[PDB]
Amino acid sequence: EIFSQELTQREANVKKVHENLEELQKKLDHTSFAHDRLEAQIAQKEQEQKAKLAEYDQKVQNEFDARERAEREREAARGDAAAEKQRLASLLKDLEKPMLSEEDTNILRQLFLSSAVSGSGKFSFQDLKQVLAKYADTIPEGPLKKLFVMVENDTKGRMSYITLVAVANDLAALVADFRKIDTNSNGTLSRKEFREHFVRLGFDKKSVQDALFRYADEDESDDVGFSEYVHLGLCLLVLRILYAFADFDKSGQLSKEEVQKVLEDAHIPESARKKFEHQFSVVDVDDSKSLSYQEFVMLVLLMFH
Ligand SMILES: [Ca+2]
Ligand SMILES: [Ca+2]
Ligand SMILES: [Ca+2]
Ligand SMILES: [Ca+2]
C-alpha cells in the first residue's frame, strides 16, 4: 500500500538488470566447455544490481520512517500521547538476549511495533541484515544458525534482491505490530491470540502452530512475550527468504532436490540431515511431493528444533 512511482520506477529497472543477468548466465550454464566473457558479464551485471538495490533500499527506509512517524501522530491525535509512549517502552524493554542498540531497537520498533512495514508491500534487506547480525550469536552454533547467517552474508547480493524485489510483498505480510496481536494489551500473546494471528498468515495446521508456539516460547509459559515474538518473527522472515532462494525452477514450491541443495549450499553436516528424506514426506502433507512455505517451515523446525 505504498503507492509511489519513484520506487515503482526503481523496482522496475533493477528488475531489468536482474532479468538481464539471469538470462545472460542462463547461457554460460549450457555452452559446451568450449574455449567466460559471460562469466565476465555475469560478474559485471552483478555489481550494478548491488549498487541499484543499494539506492533502492534507502528510498524504502525513508518511506518506512515517514510512515512510522505519520502513525505515531495519528495515535496521539487519538488517546493519551504518553499513555502510548509507555507501552512501546514497556514492550521494547523485554529485549533487555543480544547487544541491541538504540539503532537496532528502532528497526524492531518499526517492524514489530507499528504498521510502517506491515503490509506496505516493501521490505529492506539492509535493516534485516543488521538485526540478524546481532542475533545469530543468540543462536547456538549448529544448523539453524547457518540458515540464519546464509541470509546475512548476502552472497552476490542474491539475498538482497529477493528481499527488496522478489518477495518484499510477502516479507511485509509476515510482519505485524505486536500491539494489535495482543488483543488484551498485556505484554504477552496468549495461545489463542498467537494461533488466531498465525492462522491468517498461512498456518492453519494445529500441528504446525503448536510447533511455532513451542519455538517462540522459550522460558516455557503458555504465553508469548514481544521478545519471543520478535524471535519467532526474525526466523520466519529468514526461512521465507530462503524458501524463494531455493525455488530454482520458479515452480512456486520447493521440492526434495531443492531443499537438499540449500541445506547443502548452507553447509549443514550430513550428520544433521540424515532422517531428512523421511521427514520431507512427513511434512509434505498434501503429498504433492513439494513443500509450501508452511511445510518448509515445519520441516526446518522438526529437523533442527
Ligand atoms: Ca494478550
Ligand atoms: Ca514465554
Ligand atoms: Ca520448485
Ligand atoms: Ca505440498
UniProtKB/Swiss-Prot annotation:
Question: Any idea where the EF-hand domain is?
Answer: 103-138, 169-204, 234-269, 271-305
Q: Does the keyword Flavoprotein apply?
A: no
Q: Provide the binding site for Ca(2+) 1.
A: 182, 184, 186, 188, 193
Pfam families from the UniProt entry: EF-hand_5
GO MF annotation: an example:
calcium ion binding
Domain of life of the native organism: Eukaryota
Which SUPFAM superfamilies does this chain map to? EF-hand (SSF47473)
Do the record's keywords include Lipid biosynthesis?
Answer: no
State where Ca(2+) 2 binds. 217, 219, 221, 223, 228
Which InterPro entries does this chain map to? EF-hand-dom_pair, EF_Hand_1_Ca_BS, EF_hand_dom
Binding positions (Ca(2+) 3): 247, 249, 251, 253, 258
Binding residue positions for Ca(2+) 4: 284, 286, 288, 290, 295
Write out the entry's keywords from A to Z. Answer: Calcium, Metal-binding, Repeat
Q: What else is known?
A: This protein has four EF-hand homolog domains inferred to bind calcium.
Identification of the protein by name:
Plasmodial-specific protein LAV1-2
Q: Which organism is it from?
A: Physarum polycephalum (Slime mold)
